């Protein structure tokens, strides 16, 4: 049985409150989501409050995305949400990891033209 | 078959389900999939692809693949530094939302469920309309936890139930517009009735004309009471805004402002 | 206009809303109203009237007025004295439910949402099929309150999402049938996936055939695991019952028993 | 504002648990339901557990139905749910009240052929 699937869509839907609740209602902050991918992997980057919520709640920030191999800090970097990136960063996720196409979140952020993230990463690394 | 890998369920729309997925053909980038079965505009979430899952003896599994912006206007507004969202930006976002919503009307399209959680705000604050059906069903005032499926952006029309016209969206844009300044919804209804009232409490009971005869709740039940000033709940809202706001947030759909015209209003000066 | 007075909202079906009302033309008796807008059989809740609310330039408010039996099989089963519902009666109720559900198939009708809360049990234990759309959305195991909109009677077909055929109901009749003896649902799913599994946990993973290729969750994901005996959860269920039960509770819709034939099965001997 | 409308549909839908919850979550066991008719007036007769729930929870069993004038014990009597009738009865509702058409629950029950209720009422009165 899952339950920590509800948590994924939560994080995914960027449902700060449900994520919290779900969590502080006894929900596993590390489980595969029936689609195999834990939240904070599937969370709404850009919902810093959510990344921050899970992270500082027993949430391993380092996770390779089964197929993709991409990691949160990557996604955060590609969508431009420095917010989630940084929270992810201070939390533990290493801002110099590669994906299946061999890419640093930096490369992603640099690529899409995310100047800001490009900075927060073209530094602190 | 799909190359895009279903990363997570994110909503169940009428037509079917919608998940988050990573389009494996591109960077493993995030993409919204809406799996359907049967029998462009800058401000609209693009349709990356229509994957046909199975042609059969009448019925066809498809898999539309829409672009994805990982952050809703809800987390957007939730996120901004304490004073609030900057004013310049609202006019823009607000402006974008309209131009977009307009683009839909222009082609028979009526969004109907245009909540903030469907408006996407990009990294670059570029707005895109989208729908997830997800339903972020709510609970009320801390110690007064009343459930509801967030119908706060529902137009009075659709509330009382007597239509679902093009202008239904426009009422929402107004709710959202008020909310931009707001960062707190303008009308948090629990039931379909609560919401119908709340709106009036703010706007005010229209004369027995804008409000139909047949339709569910009779005009008189929500006794004329009120005519509350907009400024009371949408503070620091400049004149032309206060203006376009009420022009969108008007009871009679046909009377309520259009998308097209809304773009033209002084406000976006 | 309606003579029947809306006594209370009782559900929002697709087509619209459904309230309880007192038909003022008769004893002020209770009657189900389903207010619609546009552009007999003993075991089926009768349609007392179709009140036309407003003929217009394409769109017509109506108000169907259906008979009402104030007690669902849910409160029925909830109510019975401790040993359980008597056996004779099940065969009858069960029998009625079928004859009724059959009557619908016979005329292209597929109920789809045939939960107990839609089955009505009269004062005289006379059964009537009906639908309210109400949605008695649930919460799990005391200290494990997982939400859900009670989709426990959902067929595997509709679960995996690949159809909504005539036999979808028949799977439900089975769930309900097991439940008759039960007074506890056979499969309490939270998500659409949980439920899909649960069924299998009881019934067992069918070979990669009854279970399609395209459809949402792949057969192999719910690893073959199990082939649990019916008797384990539907105790004191006689042979022919155990029989007709599995015949309704079968994975492959086309293979699963029909309504019509179900009536004929030995059980109702 | 209502809230005790949720309670009506609850009672009406015979949602024992929500009725309870709703109640033991601070909900008024006596309010008009926006349609003016309190639960236990609009409850699912036949959901004895619900009638019983509201009744023994601050629920005035005596109420004339605006238009109809009918009372619960009446309805309970017309649908044949002795269950709700009796619970309603022991609770306080008087089993000899009349409706707009001037009818004793008895008359209703006697009329529809509800032998049982006919008995519980053609006695104890």
From Swiss-Prot, chains A, D:
Consequence of mutating residue 113 to S?
Answer: In a biliary tract tumor
Protein's organism? Homo sapiens (Human)
Per the UniProt record, the lineage of the source organism begins with: Eukaryota, Metazoa, Chordata, Craniata, Vertebrata
Q: Where in the cell is it found?
A: Cytoplasm; Nucleus
Source domain of life is Eukaryota
Disulfide connectivity for this sequence is none
Outcome after substituting residue 39 to L: In CMM2; also found in head and neck tumor; somatic mutation
* Outcome recorded upon mutating residue 78 to W: In CMM2; partial loss of CDK4 binding
Implicated disorder: The association between cutaneous and uveal melanomas in some families suggests that mutations in CDKN2A may account for a proportion of uveal melanomas. However, CDKN2A mutations are rarely found in uveal melanoma patients.
Consequence of substituting residue 58 to R:
In CMM2; partial loss of CDK4 binding
- The main place the protein resides is cytoplasm
Outcome (variant: residue 74 to Y): In a pancreas tumor; also found in head and neck tumor
- Listed result of changing residue 74 to N: In a lung tumor
For molecular function, the Gene Ontology terms on record are: cyclin-dependent protein serine/threonine kinase inhibitor activity; NF-kappaB binding; protein kinase binding; RNA binding
Query: Outcome of mutating residue 80 to D, per the record?
Result: In CMM2; somatic mutation
The effect of residue 75 to N is: In an esophagus tumor; also found in head and neck tumor; also found in a lung tumor
UniProt function note: Acts as a negative regulator of the proliferation of normal cells by interacting strongly with CDK4 and CDK6. This inhibits their ability to interact with cyclins D and to phosphorylate the retinoblastoma protein.
Question: What interactions and quaternary structure are annotated?
Answer: Heterodimer with CDK4 or CDK6. Predominant p16 complexes contained CDK6. Interacts with CDK4 (both 'T-172'-phosphorylated and non-phosphorylated forms); the interaction inhibits cyclin D-CDK4 kinase activity. Interacts with ISCO2.
What tissue expression does the UniProt record report for this protein? Widely expressed but not detected in brain or skeletal muscle. Isoform 3 is pancreas-specific.
Indicate what this protein is called per its UniProt record: Cyclin-dependent kinase inhibitor 2A
Substituting residue 68 to P results in: In CMM2; loss of CDK4 binding
Biological processes per GO annotation: apoptotic process involved in mammary gland involution; cellular response to hydrogen peroxide; cellular senescence; glucose homeostasis; keratinocyte differentiation; keratinocyte proliferation; mammary gland epithelial cell proliferation; negative regulation of cell growth
Outcome when changing residue 14 to D:
In a pancreas tumor and a melanoma; loss of CDK4 binding
How does it get modified after it is made? Answer: Phosphorylation seems to increase interaction with CDK4.
Q: Which residues of the full protein are shown?
A: 10 to 134 of 156
Swiss-Prot record, chains B, C:
Active site (catalytic residues): 113 (proton acceptor)
What else is on record for this protein?
A: Over-expressed in some leukemias and malignancies (including sarcoma, glioma, breast tumors, lymphoma and melanoma) as a consequence of nearby translocations. Enhances beta-cells engraftment in pancreatic islets of Langerhans of diabetic patients.
The record ties this protein, via InterPro entries, to: CDK (IPR050108), CDK6 (IPR028788), Kinase-like_dom_sf (IPR011009), Prot_kinase_dom (IPR000719), Protein_kinase_ATP_BS (IPR017441), Ser/Thr_kinase_AS (IPR008271)
According to its UniProt record, which reaction does this protein catalyse? L-seryl-[protein] + ATP = O-phospho-L-seryl-[protein] + ADP + H(+); L-threonyl-[protein] + ATP = O-phospho-L-threonyl-[protein] + ADP + H(+)
Give the EC number(s) under which this enzyme is classified: 2.7.11.22
Q: What is this protein called?
A: Cyclin-dependent kinase 6
Q: Where does ATP bind?
A: 10-18, 34
Question: Does Membrane show up as a keyword for this record?
Answer: no
Modification after translation, per record: Thr-145 phosphorylation and Tyr-15 dephosphorylation promotes kinase activity.
Where in or outside the cell is it found? Cytoplasm; Nucleus; Cell projection, Ruffle; Cytoplasm, Cytoskeleton, Microtubule organizing center, Centrosome
Share what the entry says about its subunit structure, partners included: Interaction with D-type G1 cyclins. Cyclin binding promotes enzyme activation by phosphorylation at Thr-145. Binds to RUNX1, CDKN2D, FBXO7 and CDKN2C/p18-INK4c. Forms a cytoplasmic complex with Hsp90/HSP90AB1 and CDC37. FBXO7-binding promotes D-type cyclin binding. Interacts with Kaposi's sarcoma herpesvirus (KSHV) V-cyclin and herpesvirus saimiri (V-cyclin/ECLF2); the CDK6/V-cyclin complex phosphorylates NPM1 and thus lead to viral reactivation by reducing viral LANA levels.
Family of the protein in this entry: Belongs to the protein kinase superfamily. CMGC Ser/Thr protein kinase family. CDC2/CDKX subfamily.
Broad EC category: transferase
Q: Name one Pfam family in it.
A: Pkinase
Ordered alphabetically, the record's keywords are:
Acetylation, ATP-binding, Cell cycle, Cell division, Cell projection, Cytoplasm, Cytoskeleton, Differentiation, Disease variant, Kinase, Nucleotide-binding, Nucleus, Phosphoprotein, Primary microcephaly, Serine/threonine-protein kinase, Transferase
**What turns on this gene?**
Down-regulated in response to enterovirus 71 (EV71) infection. Induced by NANOG during S-phase entry.
The gene designation is CDK6
* Its biological purpose: Serine/threonine-protein kinase involved in the control of the cell cycle and differentiation; promotes G1/S transition. Phosphorylates pRB/RB1 and NPM1. Interacts with D-type G1 cyclins during interphase at G1 to form a pRB/RB1 kinase and controls the entrance into the cell cycle. Involved in initiation and maintenance of cell cycle exit during cell differentiation; prevents cell proliferation and negatively regulates cell differentiation, but is required for the proliferation of specific cell types (e.g. erythroid and hematopoietic cells).
């Amino acid at each position: 049985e899952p339950s920590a699937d509800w948590l994924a869509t939560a994080a995914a839907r960027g449902r700060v409150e449900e994520v919290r609740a779900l969590l502080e209602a006894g929900a596993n902050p590390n489980a595969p989501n029936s689609y195999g991918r834990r939240p904070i992997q599937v969370m709404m980057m850009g919902s810093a409050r959510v990344a921050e919520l899970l992270l500082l709640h027993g949430a391993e920030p380092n996770c390779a995305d089964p197929a993709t191999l991409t990691r949160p800090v990557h996604d955060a970097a590609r969508e431009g949400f420095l917010d989630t990136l940084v929270v992810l960063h201070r939390a533990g996720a290493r801002l110099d990891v590669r994906d299946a196409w061999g890419r640093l979140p930096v490369d992603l952020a640099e690529e899409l033209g995310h100047r800001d993230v490009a900075r927060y990463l073209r530094a602190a690394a | 078959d799909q190359q895009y890998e279903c990363v997570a369920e994110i909503g169940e729309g009428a037509y079917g389900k919608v998940f988050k997925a990573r389009d494996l053909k591109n960077g493993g980038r995030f993409v919204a999939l809406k799996r359907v079965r049967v029998q462009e505009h800058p401000n609209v979430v693009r349709l990356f692809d229509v994957c046909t899952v199975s042609r059969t003896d009448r019925e066809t599994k498809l898999t539309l693949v829409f672009e994805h912006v990982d952050q809703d206007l809800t987390t957007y507004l939730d996120k901004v530094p304490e004073p609030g969202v900057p004013t310049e930006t609202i006019k823009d976002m607000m402006f974008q939302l309209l131009r977009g919503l307009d683009f839909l009307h222009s082609h028979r399209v009526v969004h109907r469920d245009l909540k903030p959680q469907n408006i996407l705000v990009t990294s670059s604050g570029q707005i895109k309309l989208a729908d997830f059906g997800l339903a972020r069903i709510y609970s009320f005032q801390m110690a007064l936890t009343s459930v509801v499926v967030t119908l706060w952006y529902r137009a009075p029309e659709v509330l009382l139930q007597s239509s679902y016209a093009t202008p239904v969206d426009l009422w929402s844009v107004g709710c959202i517009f008020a909310e931009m300044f707001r960062r707190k919804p303008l009308f948090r209804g629990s039931s379909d009735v609560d919401q119908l009232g709340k709106i009036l409490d703010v706007i005010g009971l229209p004369g027995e004309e804008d409000w139909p005869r047949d339709v569910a709740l009779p005009r008189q039940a929500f006794h004329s009471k009120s005519a509350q000033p907009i400024e009371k709940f949408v503070t620091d809202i400049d004149e032309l805004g206060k203006d376009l706001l009420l022009k969108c947030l008007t009871f009679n759909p046909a009377k309520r402002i259009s998308a097209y015209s809304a773009l033209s209003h002084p406000y976006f000066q």
